[PDB]
Design an enzyme around this catalytic site. Structure first.
Site, PDB file in Angstrom:
ATOM      1  CB  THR B 172      63.723  93.021 -22.448  1.00  0.00           C
ATOM      2  OG1 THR B 172      64.349  92.948 -21.166  1.00  0.00           O
ATOM      3  CG2 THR B 172      64.126  91.806 -23.255  1.00  0.00           C
ATOM      4  CD  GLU B 319      63.519  87.709 -21.496  1.00  0.00           C
ATOM      5  OE1 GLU B 319      62.884  88.212 -20.553  1.00  0.00           O
ATOM      6  OE2 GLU B 319      64.731  87.925 -21.679  1.00  0.00           O
ATOM      7  CE  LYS B 429      78.516  82.593 -10.580  1.00  0.00           C
ATOM      8  NZ  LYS B 429      77.732  83.711 -11.157  1.00  0.00           N
ATOM      9  CD1 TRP B 434      77.479  80.878  -7.393  1.00  0.00           C
ATOM     10  CD2 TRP B 434      77.470  78.767  -6.670  1.00  0.00           C
ATOM     11  NE1 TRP B 434      78.071  80.108  -8.358  1.00  0.00           N
ATOM     12  CE2 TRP B 434      78.079  78.806  -7.940  1.00  0.00           C
ATOM     13  CE3 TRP B 434      77.354  77.540  -6.010  1.00  0.00           C
ATOM     14  CZ2 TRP B 434      78.566  77.671  -8.560  1.00  0.00           C
ATOM     15  CZ3 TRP B 434      77.838  76.415  -6.629  1.00  0.00           C
ATOM     16  CH2 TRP B 434      78.433  76.488  -7.895  1.00  0.00           C
TER      17      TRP B 434
END
Ligand SMILES: Nc1ncnc2c1ncn2[C@@H]1O[C@H](COP(=O)(O)OP(=O)(O)OP(=O)(O)O)[C@@H](O)[C@H]1O
Ligand SMILES: Nc1ncnc2c1ncn2[C@@H]1O[C@H](COP(=O)(O)OP(=O)(O)OP(=O)(O)O)[C@@H](O)[C@H]1O
Ligand SMILES: Nc1ncnc2c1ncn2[C@@H]1O[C@H](COP(=O)(O)OP(=O)(O)OP(=O)(O)O)[C@@H](O)[C@H]1O
Lengths: 530, 530, 530
Positions: B172, B319, B429, B434
């Protein structure tokens, strides 16, 4: 126990807290007694863990339970194993001496017992040594379990241990001289849950368990994990109704009022429910009982399918999960009429996901699946007991040849349908062949003047283990041995000499020895008569 | 490997030979090319094992596959792992240099490659060292795989090994400087199959996979095990149709002619299928696509639900299995109209059986599931990769804090619905907060004069990582930066200062850097402009 | 097993073939049945090893024996352990259900059984599972053991194994709910033999076993290894006479005719021998019975010392060798007259070589050896069972505090004489003290109108566990409860309030529950009355 978080262990707590579905307002219902939601059930499980820890119960300990089907039994199915202890499920239908033996053998530390089983205890309590506490369970506020739970907090951090830690144990009488103890691990129970959910959850349109069902057991929770269904229901987050002590009127009312759609039972209780008068005005067409534990008879299956009940059979034992096979019907087999249906639905079934299931001979040769060649069923699955607890010689015989021996004799179709024909021990070893005592018994019981018959093996020097009959007659019914012989000798299409009618040796007996379970004692029957 | 038969190992061969259902006359269909039954498929798998053994492939070896979706790919999914070897699935949409890197990193012994990917090979073949054989696959009789299979016997005894033997690997690209390799064991793949079958098999009446379905993939078989669906279909014994190379006309014909009822794809291909002219006269009301891989947009979901398609989304990564969550709708949520439907169906979903899935902050504190507090998703499941192959520092960051870090930012509802809001890296940020670049991008792209927009983090000494825009205009379309600023500054209900409109810094750019996968390159975008 | 010859292992074969003395013309005599020399005995032991090997008996196997005292039992004491198998000594005075339990628990492979115990077997043979062969023993030529031995060679090379291999096992009923199994190793039996030979062999002139003696057992060979005396006699190479079934006339004739000089028995059989009429004209002045197993009463001791019998007592149990202590008299104590003699000879004795033997309280504090402070005896010795076979909780209680708990309550003199006063369970816990039920029972039985009395603990809220009496009257004998109370209240010199006479609560009962061993059942006695 130190675990890295990467190495995932299959534990029962993941079954409770990582479900397929969780609705905190879904409810657990105990009969007409109690009713609470899944959020209260989780809180109570944590409280029960607190209470058990306070009593000194540790990871290796054994807690024994003796009650009917209730919410408390469901809480014991989770809390005892999740603390790392071992749940010993006591078979209350055994005799007091057998019960005492199994308590001594398992070495239980605490016993949870219902008040109305206190008379069995009274006569074996002087001989129990390992038990430090007895908790008396009642169906009102005076329950000691409820009092213990009330004084605990709803918080508890459940440990992580190896997935191969033993979770449950129970004892099976079988054919030995004492009960044998089977045990299962966390991994095995978790895998049994997902395997059966994969099998019966994915059926196209018949006999499926899904998230919209309402579950009510009618087979004891101490027998085989209640076929594992209490775990699968919890995993699906469906409504669960617990009837307590099985009374047909109460059961029918619970089905009508709580709208039950999935159950398991045994043929006797199903016959009682269908033959009840209160059942004549009841809608049954959304109910899906699975009948395991004994062979489902075609007549009962037919009578149930005319009430629009989705009845089907399943197969398993104490040593094996319990589930090994279930009847699942294809869309074409659902087009057949009630007779061809009742034939299929009464079979033992096809094997479930991850099960091997061969038929073999006495020297472990694999017999063809032709549809009539019979042999003993031997299995490999992810959820089998590896041995009998504290037992060596019997354990060796259980796993002879690298397969688990079920003790049942069946043939398998080319399409995979298994039909159990008799037991290995009960097979008559006349001459060189093996006739089944079951088919002969079924023939003899077809007589209009017979209430019960047993077939056993008497000997013969000329034909070796040869057949013999015991017959019991009905109210003021008298048919001689010679007449019975002729009636049997009528039929045709069988093996041996002619069609096996010269050794019937039928005898009329007032009674046939029966165990406490209600199963005819073949061992004592062959002890008495010879 | 010496195993006692009692100790059951979870292997992929049990998935093939101990299924939920096996019909030897059910068929595997490759496009308009080939068609054969499940009995031929089992025979071919044994032949392929014979052929691989003859070539010197051993238990630890690696066989790499580079082809489209076909029956051959399905045979590689079983034969390579069942011999104990490791299936390396090559991502053919990577650039030749990346492909060469992953072949070198995995150390493949044999490469099975389709003829029309031979031009990628021609330019990296001089640098491959470990590969001893190349097998060229064709769609006619001249296939070298078919010739290899023809000269083998249909008999093979598959070994028993430990369930923790590696079965598959793939690479990946992600956010690192080189592709990362993930791997899974036999146990993990088997458990992924049963967990997902337990989750989506038991749904009451929407979005369920069962034994009466017909399966056709439309997401590559080299990406994430094709979401594990080829394994679950085989386990259910259903008909499987493989389209080969994805062409919308061919796909629509296959759906119509083979009567497909279950698929997976990504939003772009679904938009192509629905917007095709040949699709206007096609019945779609028995089809159940699951859209994973990218966020399913509400407009596409609505357009699909008016053709009567059972569309739903799912979530997962390289994953993680891949499946972590799916959208499953209650009987009440199925009563809603197409808009409230399209809202629910486009969510990331709820987590599946045996998955934990918390939302956390940067210091690994667990945030509430209030419905709006956002944080990074971290998971625990039975089928996660423990690390990156041959990698230490990146592996430590993958499993920081004892949980697997997905890299996605989402909030969770009190009822369990997960809504992915952005990526961890892509979060701006600014000041102390956020904001998500995704919502701003979605606002800006709503403009009637915009074809694409990207949002990236430029810096500021006063407000730290502050927002910036790149915009691309349409055919002969010209709207200035100040006008765009005003259009954005219109909206209300946002955080920071006022509603965050003083740092938009919009820039019109002819193009936005895109990877070979077609995903905008945020790394190069922030390299070029600053 | 690989052993270096330097590392000497203590095995039972060294006991047989490395004796203190070997005379091949010394004889083993079985009653009036058989008679042969030590050279034939060694040959027969080798033949028996050959026969057992031919039957498939291996090092870990179990052979069970059910016979009277005979030469065959002596051969089983050597041959079974020397092949490495385990000798399970069956207690034939248990009930058939207990016998069946112990056979199932031990898992015996072969059973050697005397013909006249075949009726006990007939009713438990249907429930035995592990036994492959039954060898019927007879007192004539038709013995199956003699036939098996005849067809074997007199040659056999006995293996060398570790000295910690288990040699024998037997079961003790005790105070638990099922019989408990004790076991001993080769090392333990060898060390018991040499320790006791060191103790009683070195006595100056009273109560010594030496090489000129003639040995005849009168205590079963299945009880405690027959106090280990069959091993010590063989080691000394002395003449051994086996009487078979104990009949007093036969026993007296064997003593007179074979000139027996050393025996062991229990008080009941000794009373029978001395009170026989045929015993009035018999010379007894060279005979040395040791009386273990129960307390030797002073009246019996006195009656025996006037016939010139060297009578003395010994102490031990199933868990402990069996021997822990014996009475040994100094030259000055031999100068005393028959009363002061009968006092000393009836004591439990002094501890033997290599025995610790402390008296302790309930919290494991060591009490002084003042002559009257009582406590439970706890021991350490080289020949104690480490636990109960297949048992954990009871085993923990057996070895609590690092010492073995005998369950007997005694005081020790400053010169080392031990006087057992009662059992731990039988101690009455009135108020805060512990009176012995034994002294009260002995007082009450002194009455001229009483045949038997039992004392048990009834409760009281004011004085806790308080005394209670059951009395049985003689032929046409009637003495009321109040009269008995007064008779007891007469005596003086006791503790508690006054001298403990307000709680006697005497009751006259036709019978007192007795076990199959003939010991009053205190457990059932306290079950019935309360
Ligand atoms: N569908 C079925 N058809 C026929 N027999 C069945 C079916 N299901 C279970 N059985 C029988 O019941 C057995 C289940 O094992 P189980 O643990 O219940 O032993 P058990 O009840 O204790 O036997 P017993 O009463 O004789 O001691 C099976 O081995 C089989 O003999
Ligand atoms: N239902 C979904 N909604 C939103 N995002 C999703 C959904 N499913 C997958 N994704 C995104 O796709 C990722 C899947 O991981 P994957 O293995 O495919 O990485 P990748 O395709 O190689 O990324 P890249 O192209 O940038 O290198 C998820 O982490 C998530 O970012
Ligand atoms: N010299 C002795 N004096 C008094 N008591 C003795 C003497 N020797 C043995 N005993 C008693 O006999 C016990 C021997 O232990 P043993 O193995 O024989 O238990 P048991 O016979 O099976 O008891 P029970 O019949 O109640 O089940 C001793 O613990 C002790 O109680």
């Amino acid at each position: 126990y130190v675990n890295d978080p990467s190495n995932y262990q299959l534990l029962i707590k993941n079954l409770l807290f990582s479900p397929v579905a969780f609705n905190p307002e879904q409810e657990i219902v105990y009969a007409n007694h109690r009713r609470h939601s899944y959020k209260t059930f989780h809180d109570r499980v944590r409280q029960f863990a607190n209470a058990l820890t306070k009593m000194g119960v540790k990871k290796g300990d054994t807690v024994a339970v003796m009650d009917y089907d209730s919410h408390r039994y469901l809480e014991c199915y989770f809390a005892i194993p999740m603390i790392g202890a071992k749940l010993h499920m006591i078979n209350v239908r055994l005799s007091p001496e057998q019960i005492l033996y199994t308590i001594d053998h398992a070495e239980d530390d605490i016993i949870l017992i219902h008040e109305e089983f206190l008379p069995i205890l009274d006569q074996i309590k002087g001989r129990i040594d390992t038990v430090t506490r007895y908790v008396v369970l009642r169906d009102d506020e005076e329950c000691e379990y409820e009092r213990l739970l009330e004084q605990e907090s709803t918080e508890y951090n459940f440990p992580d241990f190896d997935e191969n830690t033993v979770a449950t144990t129970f004892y099976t009488t079988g054919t030995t001289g004492f009960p044998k103890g089977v045990f299962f691990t966390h991994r095995q129970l978790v895998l049994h849950t997902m395997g059966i959910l994969s099998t019966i959850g994915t059926n196209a349109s018949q006999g499926r368990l899904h998230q919209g069902d309402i579950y009510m057991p009618i087979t004891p929770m101490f027998h085989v994990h209640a076929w594992g269904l209490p775990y699968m229901a919890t995993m699906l987050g469906v409504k669960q109704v617990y009837p307590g002590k099985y009374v047909p009127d109460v059961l029918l009312n619970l089905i009508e009022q709580e709208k039950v759609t999935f159950s398991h039972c045994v043929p006797t209780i199903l016959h009682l429910l269908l033959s009840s008068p209160k059942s004549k005005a009841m809608d049954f067409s959304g109910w899906k009982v699975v009948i395991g534990g004994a062979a489902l008879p075609k007549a009962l299956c037919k009578s149930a399918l005319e009430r629009d009940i989705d009845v089907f059979a399943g197969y398993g034992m104490s040593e094996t999960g319990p589930i090994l096979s279930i009847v699942q019907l294809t869309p074409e087999q659902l087009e057949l009429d009630v007779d061809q249906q009742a034939e299929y639905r009464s079979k033992t079934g096809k094997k479930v996901a991850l099960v091997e299931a061969y038929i073999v001979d006495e020297d472990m040769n694999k017999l063809p699946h032709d549809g009539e060649t019979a042999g003993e069923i031997v299995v490999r699955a992810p959820w089998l007991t590896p041995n009998y607890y504290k037992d060596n010689k019997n354990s060796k015989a259980l796993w002879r040849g690298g397969y688990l021996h079920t003790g049942d004799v069946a043939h398998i179709d080319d399409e995979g349908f298994i039909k159990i024909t008799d037991r290995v021990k009960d097979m008559i070893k006349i001459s060189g062949e093996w006739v089944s005592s079951l088919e002969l018994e079924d023939i003899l019981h077809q007589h209009q003047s017979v209430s019960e018959v047993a077939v056993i093996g008497m000997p013969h020097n000329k034909w070796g283990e040869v057949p013999l009959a015991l017959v019991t007659l009905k109210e003021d019914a008298q048919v001689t041995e010679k007449e019975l012989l002729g009636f049997a000798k009528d039929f045709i299409n069988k093996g041996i000499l002619a069609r096996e009618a010269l050794l019937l040796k039928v005898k009329i007996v007032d009674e046939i020895a029966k165990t406490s379970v209600g199963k005819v004692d073949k061992k004592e029957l062959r002890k008495l008569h010879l």
